[PDB]
Structures are given as structure tokens and as C-alpha cells.
Design a protein around this ligand. Structure first.
Ligand code: HEM
Length: 409
């Protein structure tokens, strides 16, 4: 750190020092991870696109990307044909999924799976969901500190995803064991074994449901020979895997983020209890205020592009901050406070454009059932520790909590 003084004096007196200082990409420290909404507002005050750099962890590398902040600038980017999720500008099922597909080929996969994710067709799963939630609160621990995130938020999608693919009751516990292994890095070998076991088992379920149709939505996906074309045996597994990882962490932190807020907006935690007709707006307001996905998946510039009067060269990586657009005061009045009664439909927590959340209707209902069952029962709830001591997990795209310590009271 003992840099030669003459060299430093040469740079300081050059008057190029601010320009070189400006061109450095802003490293996203843990302060951003805890409180990015202040960082987004600090950035959007000056522009819409900013050169930022994630800390080593995208794998082990400080990756210079473009962070886009404005609501309309985010929204237009999510619908821009020049901003592809295919970064290319013997493939495994983990690399061929629809989320990474450009509209040329994405349209076919999106339409085939569309029919089975209808709001009403997704409502068939509700009593199977309603009952599944109820077991976890009965099995909830007895003492005051409960860590709601671990005991209820974590297991709920695991049983819901098991319903989604339509796992047979006999082969249930094996699938959940694979799922909990995959979502928690207990050891490199256990997740590696579970990942293969699930992909191979999913492929066998593809064959099993092929000749034996069943009520569950995965069988509806298999039965979808809609255009005289059907999803291929590889594409079924890729679609099913994307449902698993694309739905697990999102639904967990949808519950955790929402429940965390009402713990300090108890005057709105109450209001939800007296009126259950506000729940469909409660979930939307939860997703807008504290979107589980801070940013959409990485996008690459197809051609030369302009965002917020800042040119983006082709081949550059762009990160669309959904949390910034959701908390833009220009689109949502007083964006930093939870108001359950806002008009909905303007938020982009489910993204926008062609890659709009396929599991949105499932995620929509899930929290209302989760919150409502959490509302019908156990209403003396109170947060067990001041949020200042609580942390946020270090993640690239997800906004989630390390824990949700609650007191049942
Ligand atoms: C619970 C709250 C959820 C949130 C906030 C959320 C958020 C998102 C976002 C922002 C995207 C677009 C990402 C991008 O375009 O870069 C997306 C896509 C997707 N999500 Fe989620 N999601 C949620 C729940 C779920 C669930 C429960 C499932 C499945 C069971 C699911 C499956 C998918 C799939 C398959 C896509 C890709 C759709 C496509 O590419 O056409 N999501 N989601």
C-alpha cells in the first residue's frame, strides 16, 4: 500500500484522476445485499444504467454488468427483443430450459406449457395445498422462538413441488429428500447424487405418465401434444426442473418477506385479519415492496442499444433490477412503505415480456393460502427480534432472509 508518492502525484495532478475514478465498476458490497433499495435510489437519481460489479461468489469473479434502475427503463428492457437471456452472443437439461430461450424457440415451449398453468386449472391444487399447509402449523414447535422461515416457509414449496410434478405417494419421501438436498448445499456429494437421482427419476416419471395419464399438471404437460408437436423427453425434464428451482426459493421468500413486513406494520397485519378480501392485493403489494428477485436473470445485448441515454454495446451483460423498478416513486407513490390497498397490475416482481412468470398463478394462490391459513390461526403473532439485527442472504438475484425469528405469543 506504499505506492510511490511521485507516481501518485503524477496521477492526481494529471486531472484525469476523476475520469479514471469514474470508470471503475461499483463493487456490490454486503451493504448493497442488506439495503439495495437505497443504492437503487442513489443510482436512479443520476441515470438509468450503471456499471456495477458483483463480488466474487457469478462464480468467484467480479463481473462488470449494467444495472438498470428506472421503472420504465426496466420494463422496456424486459420486453426488448435486443436483450436476450441466451448469453451466447451435449447440452444438459439444466442448460436447455425455456427461461434461457430466445423468442424464435421460446415461443413453442412457452405455448405448450401455457395451457396447464391456468389460474383456474391451478386452483384445483388449492385443497391439496390448503391441507398441506395446515399440517406444518400443527407440527410447528412449541417454544417462543420458532424461526418461521425454517419450519413453514422452507417445507411448503417442497410439498407443493411434489404435488406439481404429481409424484406418487409411494415415491414421495425420496423426491423430497432429493429436493431438500438440492436447495441446501449440505455437502458436494449429497447434492450431486440427488441431482442425478431427480433428473433420472423425472425422466422415468415422464415415461410412466406418458401411457398412464393422471390428474396432476405434469401429466397435463405430457398430454400436451397440442400443435401436433409435444415436448421431447429431454424437454419434459428440463421443464420440470425449471419448475422446481424456479419456484422453490421464490415462494419461500414470498412468504418470508411478506410476513416480515407485517411484523412491524402490525396495523396492517391486523387489517388483513378482519378482511380476507384484501389478500389478492396483499400478495401483489408484498411482491412489489420486497420482490424476492432483486433482479431478473442476466441479459446480453443482441445489438448496439441505448438505455436511459447511456449506450450499451453488443455483447455486454445487463442486469434488470426488478426491486428498483418496483420501488420507483415515479410509478408507485411512497414506494418504501407497505400499503396493502394499492391498485395492482403495475408491478414487475413476476418480470415482464415473454418470460413472464409461468408459475405466477400458483405463486399467487400459494401465499394467500399460506398467509390466510397463517391468518385464520395463530393470530397473536409478533416478531421475536428487532429487524436491525436481522440479516439478508448474500445472493445474486434472490432477496431472502437468513432467518425469520418469530414469537407465537
Ligand atoms: C413466488 C414468487 C415468484 C416470483 C417473484 C417469480 C419471479 C419470476 C421472474 C422475475 C421471472 C422472469 C425472469 C426473467 O425474465 O429474467 C420468472 C420466470 C419463471 N418462473 Fe418464477 N417467480 C415466482 C414463482 C414461481 C413458481 C412458483 C414457479 C413454478 C412452480 C415459477 C416458474 C417460473 C418459470 C418456468 C419461469 C420462466 C418462464 C419463461 O421463461 O417463459 N416461478 N419468475
Amino acid at each position: 500500500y506504499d505506492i510511490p508518492t511521485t507516481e501518485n502525484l503524477y496521477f492526481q495532478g494529471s486531472e484525469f484522476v476523476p475520469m479514471l475514478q469514474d470508470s471503475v465498476p461499483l463493487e456490490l458490497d454486503d451493504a448493497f445485499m442488506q439495503d439495495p433499495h437505497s443504492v437503487y435510489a442513489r443510482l436512479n437519481a443520476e441515470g438509468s444504467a450503471h456499471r456495477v460489479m458483483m463480488p466474487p461468489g457469478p462464480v468467484c469473479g467480479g463481473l462488470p454488468v449494467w444495472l438498470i434502475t428506472g421503472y420504465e427503463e426496466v420494463r422496456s428492457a424486459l420486453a426488448d427483443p435486443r436483450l436476450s437471456t441466451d448469453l451466447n452472443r451435449f447440452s444438459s437439461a439444466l442448460a436447455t430450459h425455456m427461461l434461457h430461450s430466445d423468442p424464435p424457440d421460446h415461443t413453442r415451449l412457452r405455448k405448450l406449457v401455457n395451457k396447464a398453468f391456468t389460474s383456474r386449472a391451478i386452483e384445483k391444487l388449492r385443497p391439496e395445498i390448503e391441507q398441506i399447509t395446515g399440517e406444518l402449523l400443527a407440527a410447528l414447535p412449541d417454544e417462543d422462538p420458532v424461526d418461521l422461515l425454517d419450519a413453514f416457509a422452507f417445507p411448503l414449496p417442497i410439498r407443493v413441488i411434489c404435488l406439481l410434478l404429481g409424484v406418487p405417494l409411494e415415491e414421495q419421501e425420496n423426491f423430497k429428500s432429493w429436493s431438500k438436498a438440492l436447495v441446501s448445499g449440505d455437502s458436494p456429494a449429497a447434492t450431486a447424487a440427488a441431482s442425478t437421482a431427480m433428473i433420472e427419476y423425472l425422466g422415468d416419471l415422464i415415461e410412466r405418465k406418458r401411457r398412464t395419464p393422471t390428474d396432476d399438471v405434469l401429466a397435463a404437460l405430457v398430454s400436451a401434444r397440442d400443435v401436433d408437436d409435444r415436448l421431447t423427453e429431454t424437454e419434459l425434464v428440463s421443464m420440470a426442473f425449471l419448475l422446481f428451482i424456479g419456484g422453490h426459493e421464490t415462494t419461500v421468500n414470498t412468504l418470508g418477506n411478506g410476513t416480515l413486513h407485517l411484523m412491524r406494520n402490525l396495523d396492517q397485519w391486523e387489517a388483513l385479519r378482519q378482511d380476507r378480501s384484501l389478500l389478492p392485493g396483499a400478495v401483489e403489494e408484498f411482491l412489489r415492496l420486497e420482490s424476492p428477485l432483486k433482479h431478473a436473470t442476466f441479459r446480453c445485448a443482441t445489438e448496439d442499444l441505448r438505455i436511459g441515454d447511456t449506450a450499451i454495446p453488443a455483447g455486454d451483460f445487463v442486469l434488470l433490477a426488478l426491486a428498483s423498478a418496483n420501488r420507483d416513486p415515479e410509478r408507485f407513490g411512497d414506494p418504501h412503505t407497505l400499503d396493502v390497498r394499492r391498485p395492482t397490475g403495475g408491478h414487475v416482481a413476476f418480470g415482464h415480456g415473454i418470460h413472464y412468470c409461468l408459475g405466477a398463478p400458483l405463486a399467487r394462490m400459494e401465499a394467500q393460502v399460506a398467509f390466510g391459513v397463517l391468518l385464520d390461526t395463530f393470530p397473536a403473532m409478533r416478531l421475536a427480534v428487532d429487524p436491525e439485527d436481522m440479516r439478508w442472504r448474500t445472493s445474486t438475484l434472490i432477496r431472502g432472509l437468513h432467518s425469520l425469528p418469530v414469537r407465537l405469543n
